Amino acid sequence: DPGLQPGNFSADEAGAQLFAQSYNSSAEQVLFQSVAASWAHDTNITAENARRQEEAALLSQEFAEAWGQKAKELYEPIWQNFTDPQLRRIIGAVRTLGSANLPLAKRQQYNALLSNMSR
Ligand SMILES: *[C@@H]1O[C@H](CO[C@@H]2O[C@@H](C)[C@@H](O)[C@@H](O)[C@@H]2O)[C@@H](O[C@@H]2O[C@H](CO)[C@@H](O[C@@H]3O[C@H](CO)[C@@H](O)[C@H](O)[C@@H]3O)[C@H](O)[C@H]2NC(C)=O)[C@H](O)[C@H]1NC(C)=O
Ligand SMILES: *[C@@H]1O[C@H](CO)[C@@H](O)[C@H](O)[C@H]1NC(C)=O
């Protein structure tokens, strides 16, 4: 999936600018499909759309996982010094991977814990 895989960037601030300029481009399609699935679950019948919403959430999560992982791997040492609040905040938001940092078994346990809690 081209949306799932980010591009090739450098470690400089201009590379970070290209990074943050492609992030919105991917976010357009992925967030659009996510909001469309949520709308279908909400504005229409709840049946035959819950699995659509679930798969949309899964693909959005994979998008964020890959893009944030690349963000961290490239700009962990230079995340602080950027001399511009906009891209600094963009990199700060993308860097935070949430629960994605956990290994496979730990992440599965965490998600199943959340599901059991809500249920
Ligand atoms: C909570 O979730 C479990 C599944 O477990 C999930 O993964 C774990 C690694 C933890 O992170 C959990 O928090 C996480 O939710 C639901 O599945 C239930 O699991 C049990 C244990 O495996 C199943 O077997 C039971 O085991 C013993 C005997 O071996 C007896 O208690 C029962 O007779 C039963 O066999 C159980 O069938 C299974 N239930 C399902 C699949 O419906 C669990 O329902 C859910 N809620 C609670 C209250 O635990
Ligand atoms: C960017 O770097 C990655 C590092 O694995 C490499 O695989 C990829 O081909 C590079 N992209 C381009 C367009 O050269």
Q: How was this structure determined?
A: cryo-EM
Main-chain phi, psi angles of 79, to 5 degrees: -60, -35
Relative to the alpha carbon of 15, which ligand is closest? 2
Residues 6+ apart with CB under 8 A from 17: 87
Instruction: In whole angstroms, give the CA distance from residue 8 to residue 6.
Output: 7
* Among the listed residues 79, 85, 102, 109, the one whose alpha carbon sits nearest the alpha carbon of residue 15: 79
CA torsion, ordered 34, 35, 40, 44, to nearest 10 deg: 160
Residues 6+ apart with CB under 8 A from 60: 30, 31, 33, 34
Q: Evaluate whether 75 touches 16 at the Cβ level (below 8 Å).
A: yes
Going from the Cα of 39 to the center of ligand 2, the distance in angstroms, rounded, reads 37
- Whole-number Cα distances in Å, 8 to 5, 71, 114: 10, 11, 35
Instruction: In whole angstroms, give the CA distance from residue 97 to residue 94.
Output: 7
Half-sphere exposure at residue 19, Cβ-oriented, CA atoms within 13 angstroms? 30
Instruction: In whole angstroms, give the CA distance from residue 43 to residue 59.
Output: 21
Going from the Cα of 116 to the center of ligand 1, the distance in angstroms, rounded, reads 9
Tell me the resolution in Å. 3.0
Going from the Cα of 11 to the center of ligand 2, the distance in angstroms, rounded, reads 13
